[PDB]
């Protein structure tokens, strides 16, 4: 609404809606439908953090079914990489490998989403595997 206010992004609002639904213990979440958001949902479903997702071919939004375990939620925290669309962050392969290297122990617990130059939304594990660096989207674990 004003210049001082942060420029919100579909990734940011998708992350915050998912987090709020998780905190309120919901089953289905209606989230905006973009290529990056759908890729992020697919990666989360692959990693099991989300029970499932479905892209109903509606131009605005699609559905995500969440998952819970032991009363709590299987998703601990979700944070978008950039609050503003004006600022864009690039992730180097060394900065990605530093995530895997946890004081000398390999670690694939926390999940990071990156979009590469080939319009392929992947995770930092595959980005490190193929030695490519894309722009970051969110951190979820």
């Amino acid at each position: 609404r004003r210049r001082e206010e942060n420029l919100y992004t579909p990734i940011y609002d998708f992350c915050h809606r998912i987090r709020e639904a998780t905190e309120q213990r919901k089953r289905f979440v209606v989230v905006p439908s973009t290529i990056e958001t759908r890729g992020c949902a697919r990666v989360m479903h692959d990693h099991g953090l989300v029970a499932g997702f479905r892209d109903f071919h509606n131009d605005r939004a699609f559905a995500v079914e969440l998952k819970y375990f032991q009363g709590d939620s299987t998703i601990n925290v979700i944070e978008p990489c950039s609050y503003d669309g004006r600022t864009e962050f690039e992730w180097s392969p060394k900065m990605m490998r530093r995530l895997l290297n946890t004081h000398g122990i390999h670690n694939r617990l926390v999940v990071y989403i990156c979009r590469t130059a080939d319009n392929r939304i992947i995770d930092h594990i595959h980005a490190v595997k193929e030695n490519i660096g894309g722009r970051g989207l969110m951190m979820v674990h």
Binding site: E79, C81, F89, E90, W91, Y112, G136, M139
Partner: protein, 295 residues
Amino acid sequence: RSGKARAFVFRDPSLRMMRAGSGYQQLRRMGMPMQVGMGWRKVDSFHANTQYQHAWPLLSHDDLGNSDQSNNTKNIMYSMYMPKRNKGTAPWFRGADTYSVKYCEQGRYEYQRYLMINRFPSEYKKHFLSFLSNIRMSSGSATIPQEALHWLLRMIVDNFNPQHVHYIAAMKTLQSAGELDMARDVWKIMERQQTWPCTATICAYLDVCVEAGEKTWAMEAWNRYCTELKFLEPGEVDPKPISRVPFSLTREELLYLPKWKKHFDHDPNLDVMDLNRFNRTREVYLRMAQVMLAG
């Protein structure tokens, strides 16, 4: 209200480190800030940090503060002399074992990509004239004939196109100097870079073949290029007009077309047709005939 804002919880250290992908230090390491000052002192100064940029053994001529002349300095090297990541951190091992083994598997000059370096037309003309003059002669009386080919190769590696005038000058200079192998090498460079020779360049190469006595070179040249050569018919136009329109880009071809397509360096293959405009094929026929006689 007068107090500032405070976060509910900490910011994730991984995210904080990840957001620093374009910091000023990273920009300096990538080399984006162009240098215009002197920077640090290089040579002949107290803090002249240039001789420390190439590997050297430890100095133990006398007491350097730890009696290095008679002290086993393994611990001293590990704790003081070897550079660290910071004050108190573990020693920074710069050894070859730290570098990847894949550094040794690459072929020569495969690391360098293709560059598209374009200049003003005036700068192109100036550079072409300077290179032509250097090929013709590089010094008063010390001009070795090899220097012509050296300057041709320098022009090549400087991402220039050695136009037919440059090729003619180089081949004529080497032929007059009597080193015909160098002229053959110039022709082979032309073949490798796919510069389609004009009729004058064909004549010069045929003169080189004549003086060398090798007819197989002229056989190859005639098969490659001289096949299409035709004499002047009485009904044809003898002084053919200029046909190649000068390069230009419209609005759409400037806005939508990619940079590599829009890029234009002077390519001799474009004006080979305009250089073959005077139909001098009789000279080529004569040179081929005398090549055959010599063979």
